[PDB]
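hey so i finaly got around to running the thing on protein-tyrosine phosphatase, non-receptor type 1 from Homo sapiens. pasting the sequence first so u can double check i didnt mess up the copy paste, my clipboard has been acting weird all day
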Amino acid sequence: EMEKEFEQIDKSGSWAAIYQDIRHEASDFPCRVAKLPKNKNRNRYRDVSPFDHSRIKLHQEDNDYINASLIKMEEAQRSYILTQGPLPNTCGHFWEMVWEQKSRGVVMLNRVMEKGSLKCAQYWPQKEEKEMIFEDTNLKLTLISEDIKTYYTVRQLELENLTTQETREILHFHYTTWPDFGVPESPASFLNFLFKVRESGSLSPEHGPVVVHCSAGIGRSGTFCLADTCLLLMDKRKDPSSVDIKKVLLDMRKFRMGLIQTADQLRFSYLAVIEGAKFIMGDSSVQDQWKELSHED
Ligand SMILES: O=C(O)C(=O)Nc1sc2c(c1C(=O)O)CCO[C@H]2COC1=NS(=O)(=O)c2ccccc21
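ok and heres what it spat out for the 3d tokens, dont ask me to read them lol
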């Protein structure tokens, strides 16, 4: 089992070598367009880029570049789009991307302020009277309402493509106590947030891929996605013992670099998956237990 590997990893204290090992094995593909001079100001961090092969392209003739990747998990049959926290000049591209990609949901795993710095643009309206219009890609965004919990908030947004006046509802799931380069408070509150996004319908295959981000779109987002995929995999066979977490993280880093930033986020992934396996394996009652534990209200 993964649970045996965990104990055994923990016992000999070797998470950091395990994680280093992954870092060494991880793929490396060109990110030439990310690196073009015209895109300098479309990238939040010098060091974090989309590979060319998996990057999301805007449907615009001017400049199709956005710091975003399609993580496409073939065996699990789920995709996500991982992106960085939008910059003040690319909140229009971010919303363009969700319109074009037909996502129903965006998962935000960070605060716009962390560790004294602005980690993300305020890319969505904070109240009903004051919608956002993104004039460059001709999109309108309105808070329809939000459901505030002690550790996360869900919002309902309306996205209008101003060019045809089509309209879509986007669910925003905002985790606000997961620290940059840290980990969720516990497996239960992580699993409860994840199942909130599952229950919501946004992950379902009748929609475009969910867009998940943190500040870089790699640490916290890779953690979130790795757990979800692992649970999905376990689900379809009902066979926990044919999931290899490290191996799934490595299929993931074929599509974007740097997925999962430290060895404890790695270790939290095992925690999250081992716990969630309870629910996957037929004990649904754990779900409401995660909710009690997580103290959502
Ligand atoms: O929001 C999060 O949860 C998150 O992940 N945030 C990140 S990942 C990250 C940073 C931050 C940040 O918010 O400060 C600073 C830039 O570097 C990467 C770390 O460095 C690198 N990440 S990488 O694997 O893309 C890579 C390649 C080469 C050199 C450095 C790097």
